[PDB]
C-alpha cells in the first residue's frame, strides 16, 4: 500500500475550563496537509502543505461547516459515554477516531478502517469486510446496535471505498505535481 | 475530504 490517506479526530474534554478541545488532522500518505483546531481564535480548516494552499476557496468552507458539525456531535458523545459507563459527571475524558483508506499502487482499496478509542482504550471499530462492527465493552454494544439500526455501516464503507479513495487521487495529484 | 460523523 504505497499511498494512504488518514484523518485523526480528537475530542479532549476538560470540564469547568470551558468546552472540549476538538481537532481534526489529516495526513496524506504520512505527512500532515490539513488541520482544524477548536482552540484557535477564529477556527478554520487550514492547509498544512504548500500544495494544499493551492486548493479551492469554497473547499475550505465545505470542510469547516462539516468540522463544526462533528464538534457538536462529539460534544454529545462525550456526554453520552458518561451515561453508558456511569462515569463522573465531571472529569476530563478523550474520544479519538482514526479514519483512513490505504490504497495500493493500482488505485484499488487495500484496507479501509475506522477505530474509536476512549481514554486510550479501544471502543469500537469497523471490520475488514466493511459491513460489521466489533464492540469492545458493554457500552459499545449499545453503540453497535444504534449504528446497525441507523445503517451507519453502509454509509461509512461508501465513504471508505468511494469518497476517500477518490479524494486521495485528487490530493496525490496536487502534491506530486508541484512537489 | 474527511468523514462526517454522526453521533454514537
Amino acid at each position: 500500500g504505497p499511498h494512504s490517506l488518514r484523518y485523526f479526530v480528537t475530542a479532549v474534554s476538560r470540564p469547568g475550563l470551558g468546552e472540549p478541545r476538538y481537532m481534526e488532522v489529516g495526513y496524506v500518505d504520512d505527512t500532515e496537509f490539513v488541520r482544524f483546531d477548536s482552540d484557535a481564535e477564529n477556527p478554520r480548516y487550514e492547509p498544512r502543505a504548500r500544495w494544499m494552499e493551492q486548493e479551492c476557496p469554497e473547499y475550505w468552507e465545505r470542510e469547516t461547516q462539516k468540522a463544526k458539525g462533528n464538534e457538536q456531535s462529539f460534544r454529545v458523545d462525550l456526554r453520552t459515554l458518561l451515561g453508558y459507563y456511569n462515569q463522573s459527571k465531571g472529569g476530563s475524558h478523550t474520544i479519538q477516531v482514526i479514519s483512513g483508506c490505504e490504497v495500493g499502487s493500482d488505485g484499488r482499496l487495500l484496507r479501509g478502517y475506522q477505530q474509536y478509542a476512549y481514554d486510550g482504550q479501544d471502543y469500537i471499530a469497523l471490520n475488514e469486510d466493511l459491513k460489521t462492527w466489533t464492540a469492545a465493552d458493554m457500552a459499545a454494544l449499545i453503540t453497535k446496535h444504534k449504528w446497525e439500526q441507523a445503517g451507519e455501516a453502509e454509509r461509512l464503507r461508501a465513504y471508505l471505498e468511494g469518497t476517500c479513495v477518490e479524494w486521495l487521487r485528487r490530493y496525490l495529484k496536487n502534491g506530486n505535481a508541484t512537489l | 475530504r474527511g468523514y462526517l460523523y454522526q453521533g454514537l
Binding site: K131, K146, Q149, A150, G151, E152, E154, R155, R157, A158, Y159, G162, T163 | L4, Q6, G7
Partner: protein, 237 residues
C-alpha cells in the same frame, strides 16, 4: 405507518430518463437512497436531512435527488446506462442517527432495446407416476420461459388460495439467451392430494413489463405488465 416507494417496476431504454419517488414516514425528516445491484452488497447513494443534503456517497453526477417541502424526495435518473439496472431502496430515519425504516424498493432495468421485451410462457407439468408410486409425494413443475427482462414473481395457487408451503421456486432466473430468461418452480404435494380430482393447482407467473406511457410500434402486441398462468386439475388412478 410504513414507507412508500413508487414506481415499483419500470423498464427504461438505454439512454433514457426516469424518476423514482419516495414518501417517508409521516414526520420523518431524514431520507436516504440505497442502490442494490444484483447480488452485490448495499451501496450508499446519498442522504438528505431536512430538505438539505448531508452526506454523499456513490450517487453519480447523472442521478440527482432532492427533498421537497413536504419532506418527500424524488430521484431523477438521466442518461441511463446498462450498469444502472439495479434495485433502489429508500430508507427514512426520523432524525440523523435514529433507526431507519427501509422501503419496498424500485426495480429498474435498463434494456438495450425495448423491442426485446417479451412476456413469458408458463407451462405446468403434472408429476410422474413413478414418483407418486415409489415416493408417495408428488411434485408439480411450472416452467416460465422466454421472457425479458427478469421482472417476474412466480406464485402457486392451490384451490384458488396462494400457498408458500411445499414450493421450491428457483432463487434467480436462468438467462438462456441474451434476450430471453427462464424460471422454474416445483410444488411438493402428497400423492393423496394429487390423486383427488377435485383439487385445482394453478401456477401463476406475474410479469412487470412496459409501462403504458412507453410507446410501442405495431406489428405485435405491446408487452404490457401482466400475469399469465398455466392451470392443471388433479387427476386419479
Amino acid at each position: 405507518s410504513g414507507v412508500v416507494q413508487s414506481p415499483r417496476h419500470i423498464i427504461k431504454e438505454k439512454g433514457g430518463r426516469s424518476v423514482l419517488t419516495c414518501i417517508p414516514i409521516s414526520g420523518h425528516s431524514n431520507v436516504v437512497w440505497y442502490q442494490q445491484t444484483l447480488g452485490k452488497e448495499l451501496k450508499f447513494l446519498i442522504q438528505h436531512y431536512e430538505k438539505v443534503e448531508r452526506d454523499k456517497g456513490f450517487l453519480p453526477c447523472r442521478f440527482s435527488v432532492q427533498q421537497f417541502d413536504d419532506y418527500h424526495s424524488e430521484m431523477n435518473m438521466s442518461a441511463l446506462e446498462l450498469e444502472d439496472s439495479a434495485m433502489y431502496f429508500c430508507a427514512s430515519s426520523l432524525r440523523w442517527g435514529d433507526e431507519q425504516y427501509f422501503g419496498p424498493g424500485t426495480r429498474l432495468t435498463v434494456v438495450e432495446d425495448l423491442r426485446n421485451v417479451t412476456p413469458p410462457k408458463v407451462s405446468l407439468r403434472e408429476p410422474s407416476k413413478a414418483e407418486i408410486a415409489n415416493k408417495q409425494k408428488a411434485t408439480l413443475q411450472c416452467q416460465a420461459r422466454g421472457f425479458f427482462p427478469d421482472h417476474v414473481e412466480l406464485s402457486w395457487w392451490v384451490n384458488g388460495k396462494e400457498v408458500h408451503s411445499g414450493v421450491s421456486t428457483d432463487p434467480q432466473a436462468y438467462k438462456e439467451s441474451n434476450y430471453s430468461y427462464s424460471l422454474s418452480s416445483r410444488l411438493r404435494v402428497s400423492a393423496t392430494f394429487w390423486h383427488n380430482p377435485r383439487n385445482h393447482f394453478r401456477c401463476q407467473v406475474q410479469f412487470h413489463g412496459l409501462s403504458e406511457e412507453d410507446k410501442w410500434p405495431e406489428g405485435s402486441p405491446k408487452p404490457v405488465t401482466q400475469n399469465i398462468s398455466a392451470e392443471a386439475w388433479g387427476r386419479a388412478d
